[PDB]
Design a protein around this nucleic acid. Sequence first.
DNA 1: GCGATCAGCTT
DNA 2: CGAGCTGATCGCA
Length: 580
Amino acid sequence: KKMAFTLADRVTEEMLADKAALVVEVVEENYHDAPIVGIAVVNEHGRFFLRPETALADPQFVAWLGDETKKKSMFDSKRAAVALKWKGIELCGVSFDLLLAAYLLDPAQGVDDVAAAAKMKQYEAVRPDEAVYGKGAKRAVPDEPVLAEHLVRKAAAIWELERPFLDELRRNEQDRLLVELEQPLSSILAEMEFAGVKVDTKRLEQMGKELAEQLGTVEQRIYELAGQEFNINSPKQLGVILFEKLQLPVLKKTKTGYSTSADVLEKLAPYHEIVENILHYRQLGKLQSTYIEGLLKVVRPDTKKVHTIFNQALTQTGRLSSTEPNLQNIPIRLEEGRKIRQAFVPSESDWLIFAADYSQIELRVLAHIAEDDNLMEAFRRDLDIHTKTAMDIFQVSEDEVTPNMRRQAKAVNFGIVYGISDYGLAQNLNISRKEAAEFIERYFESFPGVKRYMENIVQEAKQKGYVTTLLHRRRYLPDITSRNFNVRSFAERMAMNTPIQGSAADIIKKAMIDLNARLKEERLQAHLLLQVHDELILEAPKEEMERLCRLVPEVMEQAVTLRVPLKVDYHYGSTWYDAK
DNA sequence: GCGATCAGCTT
DNA sequence: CGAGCTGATCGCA
Ligand SMILES: OC[C@H]1O[C@@](CO)(O[C@H]2O[C@H](CO)[C@@H](O)[C@H](O)[C@H]2O)[C@@H](O)[C@@H]1O
Ligand SMILES: OC[C@H]1O[C@@](CO)(O[C@H]2O[C@H](CO)[C@@H](O)[C@H](O)[C@H]2O)[C@@H](O)[C@@H]1O
Ligand SMILES: [Mg+2]
């Protein structure tokens, strides 16, 4: 059973061949400034294991790592690249990434280790990472003989699996998606994460002190109105106070008790004064715990920066996710929460934050793919799409569109993009399922191309077994044939939504690639910091703002050519908050 | 400690 | 109605 390999004491020339499977192991989930516990190399000459303190101090090995002509095949090269960036070492020549390859082939597999990717091609001569390292409090790096064999086995699988993975990607017309989009993007994300975002901790600490004062006042007011002290953050104890002691109506229930959601509490406000205070307490408590305290926990004390990790291989649509901290959900909607963004500042003196976002990219992608004449014309005239939808579905002129009509047409537009269902829209607009169905019916009469696409896409998902995006990303939908109404409906909604949300993901990913290429051609010091689904956040010297005002929107607008134009809005300021 | 449940923040 | 991550509580060991 055991796999042969050389547990080397020093680096030799045969370990530096021009094609190899490479493993640079970082066990810690958060790889920023984290240890590299071991190194494995597999090539035409054999299998090798190197101790990191030895290999990373060897000039010939470091040079090999940074030589772009020396091709490497890896799994999660971004993790390795960043851990190496923290050590001052540049990783180049990664021509194949098994994690990204597995992800494009089928994102539903949830491949998060070499073993899971390998199982897709009936290769099982490698253990899962969790089996070797354990989990949670028991998580630990094993002794050298166990560690070394695991790393060599991982590199061996990568070496073996490259050909079959590339062959299937080619068959799926996804070879260019891997090589020209996801892999170059991986390198860009690595730079962004390493750069980090500077945080004004003193601003945060002062906001935290003001919130603590306001929480105390509201908290005591809640105990006064209830005539009793209890744990407000406990939906169980709160439910007793509201629905039993104060006798408030039960409009909705959960699986384990009474519902205390914001929308539920919103309806209970007129009955008792305690309701508005609990809502206010929930608002302040969310900012304090998640955005003040939670953010302060992950700020590096030396540099005052946050280094998020973008998961490029998780979502089923092709979007990225962000963790430790999640910087894709910083408050913006309410002013009190929006002020959290004042804490995100440029990393250098006399630099500014520049933010640029696509305007209605999802609805524009839908106009393109459905080839709906009305929707295409709307965007060609650059109309306010929600006002336009209201005019159409409610049969009125522009002057006759009221604020409530626009708000409801806006909801119909979101529903259409998310995969339309009468029950979901109804819940969202607080109306009946029958009334919501009336809006949908009206929409499809005004936008017959969109109705045709929605019908056709569901049919295609059933015929092929999957749906695809503009740049050939795919999502398998086996539940599209289920005889369970709920399970089948969800797959139908995903069939409708994925090519829209997914193609928008394709476009911004390409824009980021195109942008970095332009920033480098123009020798600008400007660099990407964050991506929030339809927007790009950068920082640059103040002297570069005027060039960016022209460069950034143009690159983002020209990323792809659709049947309708792409439109990008932009702003800049002293903090992320001011870039509005 | 572990994770199920509920709640809330974003696009 | 689509796609995510994280904090507090509570029942569990
Ligand atoms: O390095 C990110 C990359 O690693 C995976 C596992 O293959 O996720 C790991 O890292 C994440 C960020 O630290 C953690 O949230 C997660 O718990 C951990 O398994 C991939 O999913 C991801 O692409
Ligand atoms: O001060 C701690 C003590 O207060 C209680 C209620 O008297 O809970 C309150 O304080 C907690 C921590 O700040 C909050 O999570 C909670 O929402 C609030 O009601 C007790 O539960 C706690 O022992
Ligand atoms: Mg936008």
